[PDB]
Amino acid sequence: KPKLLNKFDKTIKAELDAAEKLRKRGKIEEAVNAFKELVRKYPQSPRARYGKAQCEDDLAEKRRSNEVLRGAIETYQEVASLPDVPADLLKLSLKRRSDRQQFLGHMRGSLLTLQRLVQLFPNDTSLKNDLGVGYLLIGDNDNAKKVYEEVLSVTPNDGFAKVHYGFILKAQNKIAESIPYLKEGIESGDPGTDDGRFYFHLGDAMQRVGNKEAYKWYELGHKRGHFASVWQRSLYNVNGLKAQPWWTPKETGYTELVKSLERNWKLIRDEGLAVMDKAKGLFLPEDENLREKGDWSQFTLWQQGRRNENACKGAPKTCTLLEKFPETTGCRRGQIKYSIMHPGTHVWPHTGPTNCRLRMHLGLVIPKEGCKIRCANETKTWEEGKVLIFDDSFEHEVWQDASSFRLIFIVDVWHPELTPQQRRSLPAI
């Protein structure tokens, strides 16, 4: 189907085929040398250069080496620099370059390739969609939005562009506007639309507008293997981990951590209050669009398993106390932070990103009435000097209707059933 041979490459098809057959049989080492031989003999051959790249690519797989793949990335570029490159081969080479750049984490470099691909092929809609993804990976939602707007004006029915346009709208807090795009995009069934992210966000957007159809989408996402359950909708999961909304200290096995938090809770409180009084700028407003209303700020001591040295200046005894517990200071998928919430605050129902952590809440300043937290179908309250534990990968909701501020201390721990190797290898969140 795809024609990858220009006029000259057709005259050396036997040599090119002989080398390609070696690569297909997994004889990577022999195939690399064969294509290198063809590159020296035919330095202008696009197919010879592409074969060298593909062989380097397959070598990285067998070797599991980044550096081998990085070499293939340059060779894929070399193909596009050669003269008289067939269009199918040109697209295949630069697309695989982008895909491998993103695989390695080179998102900025993948963008340039994707911009070049769109310039070379202005009528290819799928490449524009791929360019939009390139923008979303570096955090450039403004440019990603334009790309999908450009696609939708030419192809209004493209489901991939729809879910991504809807996703961008929802991230911009345009909840009502995002629903038709997310819903029509998933319903389209186009490749790429069956993604847990769009199920997760479509149901959330519906909950925020009072649409009772939200949980139908949660059930469908669960039915298509994106969600472990209707109530537990995290997307970065290690399958098989015990899943329950609420945990007791015994069940977690972190009894020594809990004891230390409850026995020393007053010093933890006092250092938080001192920061409130004399260094309030260390408390930063929640910035994930999780509030319907109210005031909610957090003072973070650890994130992604990394201590914030300057932040710990404000709570030195607390940070020293926590250094003894690597189950939380080493939790690269959690944080340690003070959380202050004021009256008139409601936090939308929401789910955390991962099932690999449990959340400990130590009450520090808890008004008598007005403060409560629901996880799954069960609502509970904080207590000063006491620890609550819940799995925030389950839907949970919070209210603050007291007459003064509520201060808690939040300590994330690895899911107890995670092995040491898993705790060291899992990418940080």
Partner: peptide, 18 residues
């Protein structure tokens, strides 16, 4: 842009390599 409490970002992990 990190996923602390929610799933607002397009990708929450920043993986690099094998």
């Amino acid at each position: 842009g990190k996923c602390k409490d929610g799933l607002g970002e397009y990708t929450c992990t920043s993986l690099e390599g094998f």
